[PDB]
RNA sequence: CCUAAGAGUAC
C-alpha cells in the first residue's frame, strides 16, 4: 500500500512509467533528487605531463571531466573529503591514464576507449568509461596531427550533480501530470480556440477526457504522474530511479536522526 | 573548436556522435534532420548541440606542430 | 546579449533542478524578463527564437535574411507540423514545487554573444594606496590601485 | 575644479550592480572581497573590546 | 544590374539571364574543365555596372527584379509592398540586403527590429567573443579571447557566409525562456 | 450567531464580465418587492443560472450557540457543526457602506475579499445589519 | 581567413581609416545668414592632382 | 573570485547544525525550524506531509535567499500537540511512502523482458 | 548623480558574489539598470559622519522627494505586473499557497485571515492576502473613470483600515504617484514602515508570480484575421484621403492656412492624416487584444510598454520624421533613386505601413534607420546640454 | 534553367554576389 | 576586424544618415558616443 | 613616471 507504479517502456537508457497514488510534492522531490543528489564517478583531477596538441590543457581537462564513467558500485567508494589519505588513494578514487601519440600521417582521434585504469579497483564495478556507439570508440576527446603527443593522468572521485553537473547521471527527465487540464492548473493562451491550438500530449490517451458539461471538480488533487527517466550511462536507468528514491529516503532519515539527537 | 562532450541543457552525451553524424551526412547522403534523428537526438537541445557545431580543430591541425617529437 | 540589442548581465544562476522545465524535461539555458520586449519592440528576437526552434527540430538552417518572404505564419505552421504550439509557447512546470505554471512560457533556442565586459575586470576597491606625487591625492585607475 | 571642488578619495569601491528581490529597500549587497578591502576605524571602548579583539 | 529594352519580350528586363547564372555556378563549382566566368566577365559584357552617388542621381533603380520588371488572393501574413506603378527602370538592385554593413549583416530579421536596436547590435557584435583567427596559437597578441565551443547560428542570413561567420562564429545557441520566473 | 437577515431571491441576470470564474448577479426578492441584491459569485465553485431561486442569509457568526475576525481561522475538523452545513455556498466579508437610498430604502455594501455585494431594501428588516463583519450563506 | 589590408609597424598591426573630405574642383553655392552683408557665396576648392 | 565553493551547498560548515528550533511568539504553540544545507527538495515535501496532518493548524517554509542553502519552516499545531511530534510523524510518513514506492518500482521493473 | 536621491545611505549586507546588489524599487531614483551599470560605494570613517549619513541620507528618509512633493520610489517591473495579476477578482489562492505567502511577510501577526469563500472550498482572494502586507490603519480612496461605490470594472481603489475593499492594484496605487499607497503610508506611519511595506509587498507578490508564471512571445503581437483586414482597410482609406488632398493641392484648389504657405499646409494635413491613421489602427489592434494577451497585461499594469508600442508592433509603425518633417528629398527631388521625381506619396516620403511583425520593406527600413539616427543624435546632444545646464 | 535567355529570379542574384566576393573580397579597397 | 578594415572617419547636420548614403554606407552601424554619424562603415 | 592619441562602458 502506498504509491503505485506502472511502467510503459523499458530500455537500456530510458524508462517511461506512471507514478500513481502519490502527492505532487513527493513526485517533484523524486525528480529533483534524480537530477541532483545521486552520487556518481567522474574524473576530478588531471595531471598533464605532455600536451603538444592544439587544445589547451584545461580544455582537455574539462572534456575529460565530462566523460561518463561506470558507477554501478559507486556506493562502495568513499568521498575524498572523508578519507584518511592525503590527496587520493584506492579507497576513494580511480586512477586513469591517457597516453596518445600521433604516429600516423593522418589525424589520430583520441577517444575515451584509450583511457586505461591504473589503480586496482579491488573488484568493484567502477572506473570503466561508458561506451554506447556501435563503433566501440567512446567520446572523441582530442585529435592529433603527426608528431603530436598527449600524456596525462586522471584521478576520479565520486560526486553529485550539486557540486558539478559532470556528476549528474540523469540527463533529461520528462515529467507531466493531468494531461487534460482537469485540475485547471494552467490557463491556456490562445487566439481563437485553446483546444485546437494546443497539441494533445501523448499521455491524453491514458485518461478519460472531460465531459465538457460537468462542473469543475474542486476536491480533486494531483496524482498519476507520467515520468520518463533517461540515463547518461553511468548507472542503469532503473538504478537511477531506485537510487533517487534511496537518496530522498536517506535525506528524510537524516532529518529524523538530527531531530532525535538534538 | 571540437565537438562538446555533453549537451549543455539536458546533459546527454553527444561527443561520440560526431563521426557517425559526418558519416551519415557523407556516405548515406542523408539530410541533417534524418541523421540527427537516427543518432537518437530527439530533443532540440541535443539537435542544436550537434547541428550547429563548427569543427575548427581541423584548421588548427593544419598548422605544423610547434613541439614535434 | 542577443543579436538584437538585448544586452544584460547575469543576475543569478540556478542549477538544473531549480529551473522551470517542459513536459519533455528541457530546461532553459537562459531566462530573460518579458518586460525587455514591449518597450524595445525587438520583434526580430521573438521571430528568430521561433525560427531557431523550427530549424533545430527540422534539422535545416533558418533563413533569417532581412528582405525575404519568410513570415511568422509559415514558421508557425512548420512548428505546429513538428507537434509544438505554433506560437512557441510551452507548458512549463515550476522547478521548486513541480506544479504547472499558470502561464505558458515562450521557449526556444536563441543566439547569444558573450561580451567582453566581465565583472572580474571591473570590480575595484581602495582603502588606502599610492598617492599622486604632485597633489598628494590618490592615483587614477584600477590598474594603479587608484581612487 | 580638478583637485579642490572634486578630488579622488580613499575608502571607495566601484563595481557592477545586480537586482535582488530578497534585499530590503535600504540594504545594499556588498561583495565579500570589497568588504575585506574597505575598512572602518572603530575606537576601542569598554563596550566593544571583545568583538574588536576577536576581529583582530 | 543593367536593364535594357529587350525587344524580344516587349518589356524592360535585366541583361543577365539564366545562362550567365549557370556559367557562374559552374565556375564556382569548379573552384570548389570549362571556361572561367568571373565577376570581371559580367563587368566586361555589360551585365553589371558601377554606379556612384553622382550617377545614382540620374537613374531609376528597381528594388527586386521578380516583382518590379514584369507588368501587372495575397497572403495576409506577407508585408505590404508596392510596384511603384512605373516602368522606365535603368538598373536593378542586386539585393537590398546589401545596403547593410559587415556588422549589421549578422542581425537576423533586421527589418523586424526598431532601428536603434540594430545600431546597438552593430556596435555590440564587435565586442562579441569568438575565434578571431585560426592561428591564434602562434600569435603573441596583447589580449585574446576565445570561446570554447563557438556555434554557427540556427538563424542565419545569406550574407553571413561571405563574412565567414559560419566558419568563425562568435556566440552560442542558448535555450532561452522569456519568463518572470524568480524576479532575479 | 443569529441570522441577521434572510430571504429568497430570484436571479434575473448573470454577468460574466471579463472574468472566467466570477459572475455578477442581480436578484429580486420574491417576498418583498422593495428588496434587491447585487452580488459577485464564484460561479466556477458554485454555478448559478438565470431564473434561479436562491435562499440568502446574512449572519454575524456560524456557530449554533450564541456569541459569548479577531481569532485565526482554523481548518474545519471532522464532526464540527456550524450553520454553513445547512447551505451550499458561504462567503465571509466586511460591511463598508450604509447608504440612504430613499426615505425607507437603505443599501448595505459588503466586500468578501473583493467580491462585492449590495443589498437594498426598507430599513424595517435591514436594520439588523451593522458596520461589522458578516457571513453570506446561499443555498439553491 | 586573414584578409590582409593592414601594415605591421614595430610588430603592431595598423590600419588606415578611410578619411572623408569634400571633393575638389566642384563649384558649391551657399546662402548666408541675415547679419552678413554677403548673401550668397560660390566657392571652388581648386586642386591639381 | 567571490564565488563560494559549491560543496557549501550541501556540506555543513564548522560550528553549525542541521536543525535549530526557535519558539514563535506571534502565535501560541508555534515553532520555527531552520534547516541548514537544504533546499526546496526537502522543504516542499516536508510542508506537504505536514499539511496532510489533521492537527497541524499552520505549516509553511521559505528559502529567504537563493544564495544560501537553508530554509525556515514554521509549524503550529493544536493545543497539547508538540510541533516536533508533527515533524516526526511527517518524516515517518514520508519514509514509509518512499519505501513502498521503491518496493513497487523494483517489483514492476522485475517484470520486464526488453530491458 | 543628477539629484540628491541618486546618492543615498544604505545598510551593508555582505554577499558571496562580485556585484553590488540592491532592491528593485530603489533603482528608479538612481536611474539604474542591470545591463552593465556600475555604481560607487563610500564608507564614512567617523561616528559623526556615520550618524549624519544614517539620519539624513538614509533611503527611507528619501522616499518622498521634495522635487515634486511625491514619492520617488515605487513598485516596478515584475512586482507591478504580479500585483496587478494577483488582485484580479478571478485570482483565488488555496490553503497551502496562502500559508506560504503569509509566512513570506516578515511582520505577519500570525493569524490566518478568514477566507473570502468558506464553502464548498476555502479560498482566499488575492486582495485578501495582499492586504496582509498593508499596515493596519491605512485608508485610501481613489475613483477612476466611471467607477462607482460598486465596481463593475474593479477599477478605482478603496482600502479601509489596511484591507483592500476593492480595486485592482496597479501603477496608480503602488507606483511613485502622489496620493498613492506609498505616499499615504509614509505620511501616516513614517519612512521605516513605508520601507517595510516595500519589502513585504515585493516578497509576497514575487512569490505569487514565481508560482504563477508570466511570459511574452511572438503570438502576443498577433491580431486575428478580421482585425488585420480592418487595419489594412483603415490604412488604405487614409492613403486615399492623402491622395485626394494631393490631387487638390496639385490642382491648386487647396487654400493655405493662415500663418503658413501652401506646401506647409499640405504637409501638415498629410502628417495629421497619417498620424491619426496609425492611431486608429493601433486602437483597433489594442481592442482586439484579449485580456490574456501578455503585452496587454504589461500595459495595463503600467510596468512596461504603452499603446504606441502595441500599435507599432501589431498594426503599423507609422510616419518616420526627421527634424520634425517627413523624409526630405536628399537626392534631386526624390528621397531615394527607387522613386520618380516629385513623388509626395506616403510611401515615397517615409510612411511605414507595415508593422514590426510583418517586417519593413527596404525603403521603409532605410527611412526608419534615418529616424533612429536622428533619435540617437538627439539623445547624445540632450545629455551633454543637460549636464552643462545642470552644472 | 533549360532556356538560356530566361529571366533570372531573386534567388539567382546571390550567385552574382558570390562571384563578386570571389573576385573582390572584403578588403578589396585597401589592397587596390 | 572586418568592420575595422572597412571604416571611414569624418574629421570635425553632418551626423544624420543622408539619403545618398543608400547602398554605400551601413544605415545602422555607428558609435553611440560623440562619433555618432561621423564614423561610418562601408 | 609624465604627456599625447585612439578605442570603448553607463548615462
Ligand atoms: Mg543601463
Ligand atoms: Zn582515500
Ligand atoms: Zn540535450
PDB file of N, CA and C in Angstrom, chain G residues 12-32:
ATOM      1  N   UNK G  12      53.175  45.753 -34.599  1.00  0.00           N
ATOM      2  CA  UNK G  12      51.777  46.046 -34.321  1.00  0.00           C
ATOM      3  C   UNK G  12      51.017  46.211 -35.627  1.00  0.00           C
ATOM      4  N   UNK G  13      49.828  45.624 -35.690  1.00  0.00           N
ATOM      5  CA  UNK G  13      49.001  45.712 -36.884  1.00  0.00           C
ATOM      6  C   UNK G  13      48.266  47.044 -36.891  1.00  0.00           C
ATOM      7  N   UNK G  14      48.560  47.869 -37.887  1.00  0.00           N
ATOM      8  CA  UNK G  14      47.981  49.194 -38.022  1.00  0.00           C
ATOM      9  C   UNK G  14      47.128  49.260 -39.280  1.00  0.00           C
ATOM     10  N   UNK G  15      45.956  49.871 -39.159  1.00  0.00           N
ATOM     11  CA  UNK G  15      45.019  50.018 -40.261  1.00  0.00           C
ATOM     12  C   UNK G  15      44.755  51.500 -40.475  1.00  0.00           C
ATOM     13  N   UNK G  16      44.683  51.907 -41.739  1.00  0.00           N
ATOM     14  CA  UNK G  16      44.446  53.300 -42.099  1.00  0.00           C
ATOM     15  C   UNK G  16      42.952  53.509 -42.315  1.00  0.00           C
ATOM     16  N   UNK G  17      42.319  54.240 -41.400  1.00  0.00           N
ATOM     17  CA  UNK G  17      40.900  54.539 -41.523  1.00  0.00           C
ATOM     18  C   UNK G  17      40.681  55.479 -42.697  1.00  0.00           C
ATOM     19  N   UNK G  18      39.684  55.172 -43.524  1.00  0.00           N
ATOM     20  CA  UNK G  18      39.435  55.979 -44.713  1.00  0.00           C
ATOM     21  C   UNK G  18      38.974  57.371 -44.305  1.00  0.00           C
ATOM     22  N   UNK G  19      39.730  58.393 -44.693  1.00  0.00           N
ATOM     23  CA  UNK G  19      39.460  59.753 -44.241  1.00  0.00           C
ATOM     24  C   UNK G  19      38.522  60.447 -45.218  1.00  0.00           C
ATOM     25  N   UNK G  20      37.403  60.955 -44.717  1.00  0.00           N
ATOM     26  CA  UNK G  20      36.420  61.607 -45.565  1.00  0.00           C
ATOM     27  C   UNK G  20      36.753  63.081 -45.733  1.00  0.00           C
ATOM     28  N   UNK G  21      36.524  63.596 -46.938  1.00  0.00           N
ATOM     29  CA  UNK G  21      36.772  65.001 -47.221  1.00  0.00           C
ATOM     30  C   UNK G  21      35.826  65.446 -48.322  1.00  0.00           C
ATOM     31  N   UNK G  22      35.706  66.757 -48.485  1.00  0.00           N
ATOM     32  CA  UNK G  22      34.912  67.298 -49.574  1.00  0.00           C
ATOM     33  C   UNK G  22      35.686  67.198 -50.879  1.00  0.00           C
ATOM     34  N   UNK G  23      34.976  66.887 -51.958  1.00  0.00           N
ATOM     35  CA  UNK G  23      35.614  66.746 -53.255  1.00  0.00           C
ATOM     36  C   UNK G  23      36.155  68.086 -53.740  1.00  0.00           C
ATOM     37  N   UNK G  24      37.220  68.024 -54.531  1.00  0.00           N
ATOM     38  CA  UNK G  24      37.822  69.206 -55.099  1.00  0.00           C
ATOM     39  C   UNK G  24      37.322  69.483 -56.503  1.00  0.00           C
ATOM     40  N   UNK G  25      37.560  70.715 -56.954  1.00  0.00           N
ATOM     41  CA  UNK G  25      37.193  71.158 -58.300  1.00  0.00           C
ATOM     42  C   UNK G  25      35.695  71.021 -58.558  1.00  0.00           C
ATOM     43  N   UNK G  26      34.886  71.321 -57.547  1.00  0.00           N
ATOM     44  CA  UNK G  26      33.436  71.349 -57.687  1.00  0.00           C
ATOM     45  C   UNK G  26      32.930  72.677 -57.148  1.00  0.00           C
ATOM     46  N   UNK G  27      32.069  73.335 -57.915  1.00  0.00           N
ATOM     47  CA  UNK G  27      31.535  74.636 -57.533  1.00  0.00           C
ATOM     48  C   UNK G  27      30.334  74.429 -56.625  1.00  0.00           C
ATOM     49  N   UNK G  28      30.384  75.014 -55.432  1.00  0.00           N
ATOM     50  CA  UNK G  28      29.313  74.905 -54.453  1.00  0.00           C
ATOM     51  C   UNK G  28      28.847  76.300 -54.074  1.00  0.00           C
ATOM     52  N   UNK G  29      27.536  76.515 -54.086  1.00  0.00           N
ATOM     53  CA  UNK G  29      26.947  77.813 -53.789  1.00  0.00           C
ATOM     54  C   UNK G  29      26.140  77.691 -52.508  1.00  0.00           C
ATOM     55  N   UNK G  30      26.393  78.591 -51.563  1.00  0.00           N
ATOM     56  CA  UNK G  30      25.754  78.561 -50.257  1.00  0.00           C
ATOM     57  C   UNK G  30      25.152  79.917 -49.928  1.00  0.00           C
ATOM     58  N   UNK G  31      23.942  79.895 -49.379  1.00  0.00           N
ATOM     59  CA  UNK G  31      23.345  81.101 -48.835  1.00  0.00           C
ATOM     60  C   UNK G  31      24.065  81.510 -47.555  1.00  0.00           C
ATOM     61  N   UNK G  32      23.889  82.770 -47.176  1.00  0.00           N
ATOM     62  CA  UNK G  32      24.492  83.301 -45.967  1.00  0.00           C
ATOM     63  C   UNK G  32      23.415  83.890 -45.067  1.00  0.00           C
TER      64      UNK G  32
END
